[PDB]
């Protein structure tokens, strides 16, 4: 019983670890994308006005 | 980021002597000796004009 | 640069003898941001210079 | 003739790894922010005729 309680606990610990790291991975990617889409508009914010006109 | 097309002719010149004029062309090499004095400038506009020049 | 109405800017004004180097610190970018609407870039002439006795 | 046609080909944007790609074409395509003094207005037929005559 004792050693089985020990190793079942090891298994659980690791399921939690993996699941958590996967969610953290996906969060990180989404974050990175939103930041990118935001840099695209930062480009518009910084740009100088074109005085060329027809 | 930006490109301006140089519409107006700009003549910058340093006087190296009484008779001697050193031209500043875009890209030319000039010595600090000739730049020890203030330059003279030539470009043409009538008077309604308002200008700002920078070095 | 061409300007439309006569412009006076006190932030840009420098002391008359003005020998100090930190007093002259510049970004064409910020300068042109300040005066942008009234200022249109016109002529360009540049020269290349290296160390000499003087 | 071969030389000419060759360079003509070397300038087009091929779909495989090319010299231009790895060697830093200074960003390649750039969408210019043009702050100009507006392009001088001219009628072309006048120019063409005066030039033909000259």
From TrEMBL, chain A:
Q: Which residue ranges run through the membrane?
A: none
**Has keyword Secreted?**
no
What biological-process terms (Gene Ontology) are attached? mitochondrial translation; translation
The organism's superkingdom is given as: Eukaryota
- GO CC terms for this protein? mitochondrial large ribosomal subunit; nucleoplasm
- Region described as Disordered: spans on this chain: 36-54
Q: Does the keyword Transit peptide apply?
A: yes
Q: Could you tell me the keywords of this UniProt record?
A: Mitochondrion, Ribonucleoprotein, Ribosomal protein, Transit peptide
Query: In which compartments does the protein localize?
Result: Mitochondrion
Which Gene Ontology MF annotations are present? structural constituent of ribosome
- Per the record, the major location class is mitochondrion
By sequence similarity, the record places it as follows: Belongs to the mitochondrion-specific ribosomal protein mL52 family.
Protein name as annotated: Large ribosomal subunit protein mL52
Automatic annotation (TrEMBL), chain B:
The subcellular location is: Mitochondrion
The organism's superkingdom is given as Eukaryota
Q: Per the similarity annotation, which family is this?
A: Belongs to the phosphatidylethanolamine-binding protein family. Mitochondrion-specific ribosomal protein mL38 subfamily.
| Protein's recorded name | Large ribosomal subunit protein mL38
Q: Which organism is it from?
A: Sus scrofa (Pig)
Covered range of the whole protein? 164 to 218 of 380
TrEMBL record, chain C:
User: What domain of life does the UniProt record list for this protein's source?
Assistant: Eukaryota
Span within the entire protein? 273 to 326 of 380
Give the originating organism: Sus scrofa (Pig)
Q: Where are the transmembrane segments?
A: none
Name the chain's protein: Large ribosomal subunit protein mL38
Q: Where in the cell is it found?
A: Mitochondrion
Mind giving the lineage of the organism this protein is from?
Eukaryota, Metazoa, Chordata, Craniata, Vertebrata
Q: Which family does it belong to?
A: Belongs to the phosphatidylethanolamine-binding protein family. Mitochondrion-specific ribosomal protein mL38 subfamily.
């Amino acid at each position: 019983q004792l050693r089985r309680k020990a190793q079942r606990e090891k298994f659980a610990r690791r399921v939690v670890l993996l699941s958590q790291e996967m969610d953290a991975g996906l969060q990180a990617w989404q974050l990175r994308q939103q930041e990118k889409l935001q840099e695209e508009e930062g480009k518009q914010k910084n740009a100088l006005k074109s005085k060329g006109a027809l | 980021g930006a490109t301006f097309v140089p519409r107006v002719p700009l003549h910058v010149a340093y006087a190296v002597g009484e008779d001697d004029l050193m031209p500043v062309y875009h890209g030319n090499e000039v010595t600090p000796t000739e730049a020890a004095q203030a330059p003279e400038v030539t470009y043409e506009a009538d008077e309604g004009s308002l200008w700002t020049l920078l070095l | 640069f061409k300007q439309d109405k006569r412009i006076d800017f006190s932030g840009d004004t420098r002391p008359s003898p003005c020998y100090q180097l930190a007093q002259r610190t510049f970004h064409t970018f910020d300068f042109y941001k300040k005066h942008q609407d009234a200022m249109t870039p016109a002529g360009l002439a540049f020269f290349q210079c290296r160390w000499d006795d003087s | 003739r071969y030389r000419r046609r060759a360079e003509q080909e070397a300038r087009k944007p091929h779909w495989w790894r090319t010299y231009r790609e790895h060697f830093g074409e200074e960003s390649g395509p750039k969408d210019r922010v043009d702050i100009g003094l507006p392009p001088p207005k001219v009628s072309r037929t006048q120019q063409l005729l005066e030039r033909k005559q000259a």
